[PDB]
Design a protein around this ligand. Structure first.
Ligand SMILES: NC(=O)CC[C@H](N)C(=O)O
Ligand code: NA
Ligand code: NA
Ligand code: NA
Length: 414
């Protein structure tokens, strides 16, 4: 059909065929018939796609952000970043409010908060760049009265690398003629990483198919999960659909006076990749590639906004956290007042920034949100029963706001 629409069709067909294949395998026995020896082989292609996507996050993010920050005047870059941060904050607040409202209407029913925010601040300013390339600071507790002791756990410190890349790009821009060589070096490295991303996009349909097939094979008795948490799943999915098809497109159309669904058509493939992988960081390379090629977004604007948006802007995470918090409060028959709603919204918005963009990443912040609202923590056990689905529906939105943000900021630049 094309070289950019054929990929979209192949990815959609891959998602549909993965769902069909997973249902067929589950009907034929699923995990019991296959066993771990065959389940590992069955789900391996999706793991391979995830590994390929994760391998290119660090060079792509670092080089793209250094080039983007070094390609703009410090005042212009500061204004663009302030506007992007305001847009991200407003969209996250809207997502949280929508989630709380839908949870209140449809009625579906550890680490300290300060330590979590201190860990976020520590991750913003990493103590080592090489270590931050594969580790993140995390605080555990010891019984010396609990005392917080921090150490580096596995997991790429994307936020610290983003901050360092931005400040290094600003420094390169301030250098002048002396930094032009490094700007060229990082631009060339990012171009090569884009070539690798374009190659990986062709394997992406197979990986997505096997990812969704294995995901719906592993968690068997899906009908029982629906019979248990239908209202909660409906609240989460309806909130994500409203935010990604009604609220964010309305904002895009109001600010740019352009069709937002044509914008979403060009990023359908990274959206399906996000759904398959349930991680914004891994689908970020495909997001940048599709935004730059399929959409008329500027190279520097995309390379600057999309990594920051992937790290920080998470509408789906905030929406899921708010819906889960209200659902757990309803399960405990805990009445929620106006102040309770406000603190729920604020905590969800703050935690969405600190999310690491990895599968099952909202559950970690859910506990801190419930602690802030003094809601019980045991009921999170129910969420993990269906989180594997809900998180996926989050990731789509978590990237969908970023791209629509960039395309919005493009109109601001033009
Ligand atoms: N529930 C969530 O949104 C957690 C983060 C999600 N896995 C992402 O990468 O966007
Ligand atoms: Na947002
Ligand atoms: Na994001
Ligand atoms: Na985040």
């Amino acid at each position: 059909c094309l070289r950019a629409n054929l990929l979209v069709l192949l990815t959609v067909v891959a998602v549909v065929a993965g769902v069909a294949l997973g249902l067929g395998v589950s009907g034929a026995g699923g995990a019991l018939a296959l066993g771990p020896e065959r389940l590992s082989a069955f789900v391996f292609p999706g793991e391979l796609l995830l590994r390929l996507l994760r391998m290119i996050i660090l060079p792509l993010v670092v080089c793209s952000l250094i080039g983007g920050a070094a390609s703009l005047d410090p005042g212009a870059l500061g204004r663009l970043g302030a506007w992007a941060l305001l847009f991200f904050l407003v969209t996250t607040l809207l997502a949280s409010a929508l989630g709380v409202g839908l949870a209140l209407a449809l009625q579906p029913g550890s680490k300290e908060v300060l330590d979590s925010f201190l860990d976020l601040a520590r991750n913003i300013f990493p103590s080592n760049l090489v270590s931050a390339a594969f580790r993140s600071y995390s605080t555990t507790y010891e019984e010396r009265v609990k005392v917080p002791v921090g150490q580096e756990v596995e997991g790429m410190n994307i936020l610290g690398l983003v901050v360092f890349a931005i400040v290094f790009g600003v420094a390169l821009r301030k250098l002048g003629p002396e930094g032009e060589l490094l700007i060229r070096f990082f631009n060339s490295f990012n171009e090569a990483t884009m070539v690798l991303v374009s190659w990986i996009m062709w394997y992406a349909p197979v990986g997505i198919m096997f990812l969704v097939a294995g995901k719906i094979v592993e968690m068997e008795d899906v009908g029982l999960l629906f019979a248990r948490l239908g209202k909660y799943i409906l609240c989460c999915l309806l909130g994500h659909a409203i935010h990604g098809l009604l609220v964010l497109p309305l904002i895009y159309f109001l600010f740019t006076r352009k069709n937002p669904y044509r914008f979403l058509w060009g990023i359908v493939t990274p959206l399906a990749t996000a759904f398959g992988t349930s991680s914004s960081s891994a689908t970020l390379p495909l997001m940048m590639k599709c935004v730059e090629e399929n959409n008329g977004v500027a190279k520097h604007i995309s390379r600057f906004i999309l990594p920051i948006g992937a790290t920080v802007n998470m509408d789906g995470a905030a929406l899921f956290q708010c819906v889960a918090a209200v659902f757990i409060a309803q399960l405990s028959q805990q009445s929620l007042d106006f102040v309770k709603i406000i603190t729920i919204l604020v905590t969800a918005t703050a935690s969405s920034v600190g999310a690491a963009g990895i599968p099952a990443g909202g559950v970690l912040t859910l506990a801190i949100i419930l602690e802030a609202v003094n809601l019980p923590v045991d009921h999170i056990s129910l969420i993990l029963a269906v989180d594997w689905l809900v998180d996926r529906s989050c990731t789509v939105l978590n990237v969908e706001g970023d791209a629509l943000g960039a395309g919005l900021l493009q109109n601001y630049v033009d």
